[PDB]
């Protein structure tokens, strides 16, 4: 839903990473969201028993 001015092509967040990008053929604004997210933990009773 971001509305880029005609002279702008890329968008950057506070960490300077690219967040919004204009498609050079359809002239529509698209957002880039990372693919990795969420924590993972493993519960083991000890490898010498199971």
């Amino acid at each position: 839903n971001k509305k880029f001015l005609p002279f702008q092509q890329f968008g950057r967040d506070i960490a300077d990473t690219t967040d919004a990008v204009r498609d050079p053929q359809t002239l529509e604004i698209l957002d880039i969201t990372p693919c990795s997210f969420g924590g993972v933990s493993v519960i083991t009773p000890g490898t010498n028993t199971s």
């Binding site: 001015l5 002279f7 092509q9 890329f10 968008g11 950057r12």
Partner: protein, 50 residues
């Protein structure tokens, strides 16, 4: 062909305050809800402008 419009060389110029004027976009990237620090040849606030 130009015929001199005025004989008076100069008049004493008087200055006003440029309250918070002359701010230009430093780069062509889009930022939302961002407080951004940039160094460039800006016009000083509350300056003397002829």
């Amino acid at each position: 062909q130009c015929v001199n419009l005025t004989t008076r060389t100069q008049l004493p110029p008087a200055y006003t305050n440029s309250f918070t004027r002359g701010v230009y976009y430093p780069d062509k990237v889009f930022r939302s809800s961002v407080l951004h620090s940039t160094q460039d040849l800006f016009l000083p606030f509350f300056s003397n402008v002829t």
